[PDB]
Amino acid sequence: ELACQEITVPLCKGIGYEYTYMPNQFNHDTQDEAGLEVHQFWPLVEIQCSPDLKFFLCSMYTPICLEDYKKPLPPCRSVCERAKAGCAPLMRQYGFAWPDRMRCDRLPEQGNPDTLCMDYER
Amino acid sequence: ELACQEITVPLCKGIGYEYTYMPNQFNHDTQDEAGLEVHQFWPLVEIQCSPDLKFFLCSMYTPICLEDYKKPLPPCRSVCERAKAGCAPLMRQYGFAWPDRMRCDRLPEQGNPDTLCMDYER
């Protein structure tokens, strides 16, 4: 189902977990393809409008792969809400809308035993 | 391995999940043994000093067991803090301290980078 592969995307190395799987939720078949899209957020990550932006992005583009849990473990909605609250305003100021694919309501909320997610808060 | 078994402990019905595993953290080998201890909290649950008490107690004595996730999923520290804040004072009124086994400091917090934990409240 989910074949784990060591993370190679530079922006996502050493983020807390070392393996990912493909294709991801965006149908990217390789890390290089995912990297071409997520690296566009490198500047915003460096600017630090949100401490959770890098983890949020990587949890979507290079999703965590666990040999024990053969199921996707997306970031919880709370992670996205924090990233959005911190960075969406600056983005809007320069003419960037919050990407539809990053809409937080698309993610599961924390606290549901039947639909687990990562709610890491940096 | 965590072999899931349907929860039979009367006090632990209506807590948001229906399966547990044994032995639990207290080395109880069966639900009847765990039930003998957790049922001592029956009066406090009925008095409703905390809406979180029942889930908290059960998440400790009849821990959550999932078919996909094969690892202990403890309640987050926040759950314990709310239950304690709501019921500890009452217990103290009669001369009893919050049980050491239910100490909140040893539980992981929401957003921690190591272990997933459960708290229905966000």
Spell out the residues 6+ positions from residue A14 whose beta carbon is closer than 8 angstroms to its own.
none
- B113 with A16: Cβ contact below 8 A: yes
Please state whether beta strands B19-20 and B5-6 pair in parallel, antiparallel, or not at all (unpaired): antiparallel
Instruction: Identify how the structure was determined.
Output: X-ray
Q: How many CA atoms within 13 Å lie on the side-chain side of A116?
A: 22
Strand segments, DSSP code E, in chain A are 5-6, 19-20
Strand segments, DSSP code E, in A29-105 are none
Nearest Cα to Cα of residue A87 among A52, A43, A49, A46: A49
- Residue A7 DSSP class: -
Smallest Cβ–Cβ distance between A109 and the set B66, B116, B122 belongs to: B122
Chain A interface with B: residues with Cβ < 8 Å: 16, 68-71, 78, 109-111, 113-114, 116, 118-121
List of domains in chain B: 1-122 (1.10.2000.10)
| Closest-approach residue (CA) in chain B for A78 | B122
- Report the amino acid identity of residue B89: P
DSSP string, B89-115: HHHHHTT-PPPGGG-STTSPPTT-SS-
Q: Establish whether B43 is an annotated binding residue.
A: yes
| Closest-approach residue (CA) in chain B for A52 | B111
- A16 with B121: Cβ contact below 8 A: no
Yes or no: say if B75 and B121 are a contact pair by the CB < 8 Å rule.
Answer: no
B88-to-A107, B35, B44, B53, B64 alpha-carbon distances in Å: 36, 21, 10, 11, 24
**How far is the C-alpha of A108 from the C-alpha of B33, rounded, in Å?**
35
**How far is the C-alpha of A34 from the C-alpha of A37, rounded, in Å?**
5
Q: Which helix (H) or strand (E) holds B19?
A: strand B19-20
Q: Establish whether B47 is an annotated binding residue.
A: yes
- B112 with A118: Cβ contact below 8 A: no
Residue entry with tokens 């009849």: B62
**How far is the C-alpha of B64 from the C-alpha of B74, rounded, in Å?**
8
- Name every chain B residue with its beta carbon within 8 A of the beta carbon of A120: 111-113
Resolution to one decimal, Å? 1.4
Task: Give the other-Cβ count within 10 Å of B104's Cβ.
Answer: 19
